[PDB]
């Protein structure tokens, strides 16, 4: 019963972006908030200047 | 027009429109028999291109018309009795009639499978 929710196959969202053609049901998730920006990263051009400081 | 102008007969029948197949529409006939005066080829007009198989038929009423031969390959020639029906070749000028394929001398397309009733083709009977 504890492992039941792990093997339960999740149905992709109706209007999905990542699992529209994914045939590996193990990776299919709810997809909610997976692309929200939490203001915790900069552009690749910024990492060049940050690595320079390190 | 005023009521006086109508009372004197201003309303007249609209000018008649020419029929698609006048030789048949004039006498209310669905088809007519005729002898082939000439069997040749007609060239379509500007947009289309090719060779349209036509026949100069002398109807039993005396009129000489040009009929289109539908299908691939025909059997009629000079002095051939064929049945004519209405309907015209749109791209051919003067070809205002069609020949019936299951007619007297004109034979139906032998190697025909689809729309056999349009080309007077008996069923292959290969199953029986």
């Amino acid at each position: 019963q504890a492992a039941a929710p792990l093997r339960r196959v999740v149905m992709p969202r109706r209007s999905t972006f990542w699992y529209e053609e994914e045939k590996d049901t193990d990776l299919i998730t709810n997809e909610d908030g997976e692309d929200d920006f939490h203001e915790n990263d900069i552009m690749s051009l910024g990492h060049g200047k940050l690595e320079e400081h390190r | 027009a005023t009521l006086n102008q109508v009372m004197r007969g201003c309303r007249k029948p609209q000018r008649a429109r020419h029929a698609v197949s006048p030789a048949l529409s004039s006498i209310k006939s669905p088809a007519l028999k005729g002898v082939c005066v000439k069997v040749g080829i007609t060239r379509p007009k500007k947009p289309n291109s090719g060779e349209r198989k036509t026949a100069r038929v002398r109807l039993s009423t005396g009129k000489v018309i040009t009929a289109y031969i539908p299908g691939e390959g025909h059997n009629i020639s000079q002095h051939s009795v064929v049945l004519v029906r209405g309907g015209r070749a749109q791209d051919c000028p003067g070809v205002r009639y069609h020949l019936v394929r299951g007619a007297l001398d004109l034979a139906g397309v032998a190697t025909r499978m689809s729309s056999r009733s349009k080309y007077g083709t008996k069923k292959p009977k290969k199953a029986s």
Binding site: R13, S15, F17, E31, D32 | -
Partner: protein, 95 residues
């Protein structure tokens, strides 16, 4: 509920004031679709002018009209305009 995957009903959600789920329950229909063309210095520019209607089926109807180079975008413009231009239509016995 993730229904709006392109944020197209965000502004319409403010004007009208109904959830996206309630917006999708309206009866929309693309009535007219014209292929208009404008002659410009750079050649012909063909657009897709469409007209869309929206209604509840219970005394509300709205007419929207928009054009665009893409037939899909014009149908969305006209749909948003049709849902915000809805008006009450008087009916005799609601029939």
């Amino acid at each position: 509920d993730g229904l709006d995957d392109k944020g197209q009903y965000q502004e319409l959600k403010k004007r009208t004031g109904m959830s996206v789920r309630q917006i999708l329950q309206l009866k929309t229909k693309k009535l007219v679709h014209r292929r208009v063309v404008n002659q410009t210095r750079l050649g012909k520019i063909a657009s897709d002018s469409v007209m869309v209607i929206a209604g509840n089926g219970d005394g509300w109807l709205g007419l929207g009209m928009a054009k665009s180079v893409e037939a899909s975008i014009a149908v969305e413009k006209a749909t948003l305009l049709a849902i915000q231009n809805m008006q009450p239509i008087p009916r005799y016995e609601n029939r």
